Amino acid sequence: TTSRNFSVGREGLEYVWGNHEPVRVWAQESAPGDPHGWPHEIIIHYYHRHPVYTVIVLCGVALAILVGTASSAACIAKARRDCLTPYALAPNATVPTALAVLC
Amino acid sequence: FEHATTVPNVPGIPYKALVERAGYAPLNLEITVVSSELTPSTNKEYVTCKFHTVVPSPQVKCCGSLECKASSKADYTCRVFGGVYPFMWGGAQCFCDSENTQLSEAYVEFAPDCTIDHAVALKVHTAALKVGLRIVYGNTTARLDTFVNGVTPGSSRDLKVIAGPISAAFSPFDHKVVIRKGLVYNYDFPEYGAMNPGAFGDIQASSLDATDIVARTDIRLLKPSVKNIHVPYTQAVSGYEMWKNNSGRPLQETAPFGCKIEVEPLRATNCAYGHIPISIDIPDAAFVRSSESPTILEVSCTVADCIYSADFGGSLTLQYKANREGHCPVHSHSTTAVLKEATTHVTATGSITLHFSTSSPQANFIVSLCGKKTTCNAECKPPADHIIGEPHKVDQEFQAAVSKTSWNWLLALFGGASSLIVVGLIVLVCSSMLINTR
Amino acid sequence: FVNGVTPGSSRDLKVIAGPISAAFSPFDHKVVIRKGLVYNYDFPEYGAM
Numbered sequence A: 001t002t003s004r005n006f007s008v009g010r011e012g013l014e015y016v017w018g019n020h021e022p023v024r025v026w027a028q029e030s031a032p033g034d035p036h037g038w039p040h041e042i043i044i045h046y047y048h049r050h051p052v053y054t055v056i057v058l059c060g061v062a063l064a065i066l067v068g069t070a071s072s073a074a075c076i077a078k079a080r081r082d083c084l085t086p087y088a089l090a091p092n093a094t095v096p097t098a099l100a101v102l103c
Numbered sequence B: 001f002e003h004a005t006t007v008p009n010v011p012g013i014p015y016k017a018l019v020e021r022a023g024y025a026p027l028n029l030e031i032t033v034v035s036s037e038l039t040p041s042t043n044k045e046y047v048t049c050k051f052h053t054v055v056p057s058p059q060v061k062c063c064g065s066l067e068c069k070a071s072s073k074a075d076y077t078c079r080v081f082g083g084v085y086p087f088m089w090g091g092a093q094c095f096c097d098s099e100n101t102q103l104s105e106a107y108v109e110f111a112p113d114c115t116i117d118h119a120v121a122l123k124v125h126t127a128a129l130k131v132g133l134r135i136v137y138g139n140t141t142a143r144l145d146t147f148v149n150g151v152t153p154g155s156s157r158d159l160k161v162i163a164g165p166i167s168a169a170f171s172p173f174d175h176k177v178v179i180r181k182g183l184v185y186n187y188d189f190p191e192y193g194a195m196n197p198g199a200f201g202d203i204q205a206s207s208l209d210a211t212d213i214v215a216r217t218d219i220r221l222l223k224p225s226v227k228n229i230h231v232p233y234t235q236a237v238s239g240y241e242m243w244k245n246n247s248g249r250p251l252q253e254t255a256p257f258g259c260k261i262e263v264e265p266l267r268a269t270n271c272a273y274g275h276i277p278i279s280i281d282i283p284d285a286a287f288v289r290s291s292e293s294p295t296i297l298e299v300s301c302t303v304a305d306c307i308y309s310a311d312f313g314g315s316l317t318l319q320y321k322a323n324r325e326g327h328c329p330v331h332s333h334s335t336t337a338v339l340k341e342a343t344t345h346v347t348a349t350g351s352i353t354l355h356f357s358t359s360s361p362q363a364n365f366i367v368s369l370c371g372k373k374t375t376c377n378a379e380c381k382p383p384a385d386h387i388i389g390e391p392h393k394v395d396q397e398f399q400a401a402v403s404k405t406s407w408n409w410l411l412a413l414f415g416g417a418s419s420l421i422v423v424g425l426i427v428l429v430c431s432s433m434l435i436n437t438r
Numbered sequence C: 001f002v003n004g005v006t007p008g009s010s011r012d013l014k015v016i017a018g019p020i021s022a023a024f025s026p027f028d029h030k031v032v033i034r035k036g037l038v039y040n041y042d043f044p045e046y047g048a049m
């Protein structure tokens, strides 16, 4: 006598023993994914199922965040430099009227 | 009327569909795959089994000469020696220093028990399917059986319903196989007339009792021993017993999709995979004019409760107003979830409770009663028990497990700074022109 | 046979040959036979009339 651990997929698994007709046993998911209107660690459930396709979304989210931040920062900085440079102003001065708005 | 629809390969899983016709109530059609029967095309190659050798009484010439003739017996061999003094209980039968000669021969035949211990080598090909269906339309049941080939309609009530071809062909059978005592083993046996001593199929025969037989198992005769007449021989063990000790496990315990395989048809059964299209013709008599069917009014959908599960763990409630009595079917126009019952008694203002199941915890869909329909949205939870073999995944997942909350977080997440970038560029252009004013 | 595995037996001299350089088969997968004649035809399936 002993014990054995057999992994079962979502599809289904067969099971034999002794000399009697076998029994088929399948499985489903029970990890705690869905939230209840409050902040929650839903990701863990989505990590328990399909460890693929679950972190790829996070990587894409990070990529989008970085792309947006970098592009916005570069464009705002360049536009500000263009608006300020030929104007050739100084901080706390009379000419920087538009500056009173800009910064 | 005529209709078409595709169903996955699986046994004992009723699917409920609707046929819509203006002026006629949409009949509820129930389709069940009672059983499956995959039957390939077979060819018999040769039989084999444990063999018994033959050591016939020797041909001894007292003070003479002999030779090594030929014969048609399988593994037939002869060999001769001279200057032999055989002996026996009454004494020495003959002695002649050189003139004596002895001739021995050897062959083989299938053992008497072979008749039941025999195995056979089979050449298989061109897997073909036979499917049994139970189809119910308007409490009109029909049991039918037909091939999946798109040409032949099975006959049941003389209603020709075509189906197939199979979406994807699956065959656990290799082109070559062996059969023994009700078991089927996947093996690459050698060709007829091709043998190797100590190897499987060392002995062949077109029939279990065919007179013709051929083999080759390295039978070389041995010189006579000291003073006692006998026939010392040599030969390699039967490949039958060797292959038995190491034949490998039966295909019964290795086929995918839970095939149930039997020998006398050399077929598989209740083995499910893929999808099948189906064409269905229906008499118009079975159809019912809409006016005859009851009408409904201001029906509402109410989810009493629902836990995401495998069985019909989802529960729903419906409140309806009607001007007529009778029956109506119900349907889930959204694939993600499927009901468990077809129709029920109706009432002028009654309400009912319904069972169903789903492939996602998001119970957002539309459901039709009589000809009208109403929406139903809710959230279902995963269950505690997570190991059961009863029917499950009646619908395949469609990446719809994504909760509405996750969609809400994703929508507000993705940025739109590119609009800010374009606004910055436009103001940059205007400021550049203003600077150009100087 | 032309199969590269089996040697035909003649004097117990095993001479192997093949495989065929190019396979040729006038027979279609489906055929009909009648009175000693063979006609190449695509007959319908059993139970299909």
Ligand SMILES: *[C@@H]1O[C@H](CO)[C@@H](O)[C@H](O)[C@H]1NC(C)=O
Pocket: B138, B139, B327
């Ligand atoms: C099937 O239902 C119709 C009404 O929908 C009814 O008239 C008929 O008697 C029923 N047939 C059976 C066999 O129950």
